[PDB]
Subunit: 293 residues, 4 copies
């Protein structure tokens, strides 16, 4: 089976000014991740891809383009979670039919679902698609917080391979590895890669890897090698780029940085501000010149 | 044009065991609201409706069935908000074409949208539909808390009539009324109806009105006439049933209570637990005898 | 036991520039509350008195001075709560010896105490002093939320008379009046008096009553009589005043307003900013011109 | 001026049944830390010492006792923070008069103090004593969170040496080390020692070091040498011990663990539960058997 460890970019999507997918531009983002960032894989349809603002047909279109463009050069994970469990099932089947290596699904949100509800939801996607699953935690956006016992119950399904941990609880992180050493863990906070890698994470799924893949791989590998002083430096420079990107607007700044690489990363999708201001464009141009040139 | 003040039930939906809509059962729920609960109107497609777990096609069907069953008997408000602004526009246009009296929209959620992205979302839905808009505030599910200055900005659009205040900040409630005396406020917490009415709210949109509609109108109408003592006792009795409903599980219990009336309110839609256990059914029946017989 | 229902000012204390107690100014604040604000009682040693920034001796001094000036002209409640239980027993005993009518105590804070620890704390102050107790709930400062079952445990001690409800949950508020109809509730949020009174609170303990006691009384009295329109208008003006007080600096503005009545309300105690800026003093004078002249 | 890097046990205090200090047992906790735990220092008067439950004189006695027992064998840091700045200055001078190597002070709590108020409070303690200061950050108890720009203001006083980072934000800890590379950082969460040491903290101040000081030093030193796999193994076993401790009652379990080494660690001080139950006593025994034998 395909190896899911390593560096995964959470794929960003190029949109036209009217909010439609810019396929050509999406293809240039995938090619940049594979050829330049040298990621081990892509995590498609996640929050970074502006996924929760799209229709079911557009999600399928994004899955088709990413698999068509990446082919078998890298690993591919498909994020198909939704508040609509039938939608999640139908997406999961589609990505399974396309050949994605594994599914992933955000905790169902909005409503306050009980834990048994959350487990039934994972079990149903798995059962209905026949594919392996990566639980996707992102407490800051869903408000859902899972504890060690709850990961154990999800892990009773043997097709659940592990978790995309976009959480800053390093105590929980450590406990997960202690209690389920065979389950994988992908760090989801790019600004906390080093500390996460010192606790044995198996890889990382990140939005800033779209532009900072080289450094990200460097932190990861240097940490895994015990080369902590060197890793910290690169995390320091990374975190200065990250800090500028968060202050200037995450999605637009990563898109403007890609444009400066000649990738037609296009606009954001509304209700997110679709166009950068002059100030955002000048600031990206300064981030490029300081950290990515 | 039609008056939107008064008592609106937040319409629950009947589902079949496989998740599909039970059109006959749904029709019965509407008929129960109109004929026995004597609501002034229905609020269709809100959270109570299990709306964010469905496809756009299923939300359109629910809107077609309510309009066709209720006719012009009562006021109809169509909640069409979503993380997908294109979907909000499409639903918005469909509800406007169906003849609903007004639209409503939840603040866009999941992503941390800025205020102006939120305002631009409301202005876009109005601009594509030409209908009046009710801002739907539900901080406990969204994580979005707007303040007086933000409500004023939203209220620059004249199509914005007011807000479904599903919040318990009674200082803010008072300030909205003092600041925008001509804008409407619907109370959203059924168990807090009297305190909200004492500050001048113009009506209430609630899920417990599907079964406790006679009592809700009395708290409201007695509070408005200053008969606070009588009002409080009815709110006392009402809160006993609400505490019962909440402890037994809100969606299923209101549906089971609907069944006890002769209404095929059905199952809940998955990822919510679709079937009531035997304990849940028994408790529904005790709530029936005690409070609604 | 003297009647404790009605309007109570949470007493502010006057401090000299060096942080010591200005006895003379303290007497003038007390005289202003009894004579001009026409309060039913004083709640001495609370949050508003700047109590938690003071030594055990200074707390005793304030209880001496308040009892000497008020004598038996009004009811006196003594807030003796602390993270230190020996200190709360010591203060409770001194205030009981001076003749305070009732004791009050904030839930022990800082550390996360269990509910049995909180209950043992109240029972210990009561058993050591022999006085009646008002449970002082203030979630915004303490982080402690208690429910109906816990209040019932607290109410197994018959010397606990009820709760200073400084919290915004109007559902919990209703439930408490319903479950424990003979226990008293004093509202703690001045800007939500009206809705609290509609739920049958028995009185109110508030910091703004040191300057706005005339209106405070009217809202409570008009609300309990069913004269809601009059009440609501007086709540609307009170809330304009309170919004300006809150925006200008709660503690300093009230003392600045007191000084415009000829009361030497003095400075705030450090770590709190001790002197009003020229802008704060100017805003106080505007508030006084518009709402208190 | 003496070196403050390294492993610091947040000293636990031995109380008698009646809550008074048991000086003999306090001396044995000190000799165990210095002689068997091999710490570099003690952090006296922190939360772990049950400090905010005591009187000023009792705070002074513990300062007197620990200095007198430790002498100049190890570094000593005196936590003197309080909501009473006057007390904080008085304890600060006393600790300075006894020869403590540095002071430390929790951000004033309970009231919602402003940043400039927080800064003025540390600058006053520094000015009145002439001692250096370690800013004590514990957001989960105080609710005070401070950012990069706030540390920068605090760091404008040269006598501020750094921070007792009792927080889980690893992005903020990376940014702190990047922005103020010469200011010290001590990790406050024992169970997150390793990831904290991977980001370059200069030492750790911890309550579990009273009994697990040998492993705590190994994790630190191993991580600083980039021996991540051994570090992790030892963090894992440490975290099973801490998990059991947290689950049984942190305060009573460390004392019971102490008593199983023949240290008379005594009772907790009330309002905390003073006596361990038979179940808490049997589980400490199991914890000693599995991890400290």
């Amino acid at each position: 089976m395909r190896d899911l460890k390593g560096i995964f970019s959470a794929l960003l999507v190029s949109f036209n000014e009217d909010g439609t997918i810019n396929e050509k531009g999406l293809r240039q983002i995938i090619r940049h991740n594979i050829d330049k960032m040298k990621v081990d894989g892509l995590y498609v349809g996640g929050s970074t891809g502006e996924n929760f603002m799209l229709s079911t047909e557009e999600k399928k279109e994004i899955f088709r383009i990413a698999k068509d463009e990446a082919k078998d050069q890298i690993a591919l994970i498909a994020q198909v979670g939704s508040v609509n469990l039938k939608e999640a099932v139908e997406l999961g089947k589609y990505a399974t039919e396309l050949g994605y290596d594994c599914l992933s699904a955000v905790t169902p949100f909005y409503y306050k679902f009980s834990f048994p509800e959350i487990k039934h939801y994972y079990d149903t996607i798995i059962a209905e698609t026949g594919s392996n699953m990566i639980v996707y935690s992102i407490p800051f956006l869903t408000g859902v917080n899972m504890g060690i016992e709850q990961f154990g119950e999800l892990y009773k399904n043997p097709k659940v391979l592990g978790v995309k941990f976009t959480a800053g609880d390093f105590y929980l992180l450590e406990r997960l590895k202690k209690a389920y050493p065979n389950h994988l863990i992908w760090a989801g906070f790019d600004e906390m890669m080093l500390p996460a890698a010192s606790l044995g994470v198996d890889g990382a799924i990140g939005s800033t890897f779209n532009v900072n893949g080289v450094r990200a791989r460097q932190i990861f590998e240097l940490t895994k090698a015990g080369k902590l002083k060197e890793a910290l430096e690169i995390q320091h420079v990374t975190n200065d780029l990250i800090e500028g990107i968060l202050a200037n607007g995450l999605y637009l700044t990563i898109k403007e940085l890609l444009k400066l690489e000649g990738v037609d990363a296009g606009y954001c999708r509304e209700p997110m501000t679709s166009k950068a201001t002059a100030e955002q464009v000048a600031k990206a141009k300064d981030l490029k010149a300081k950290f990515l040139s």
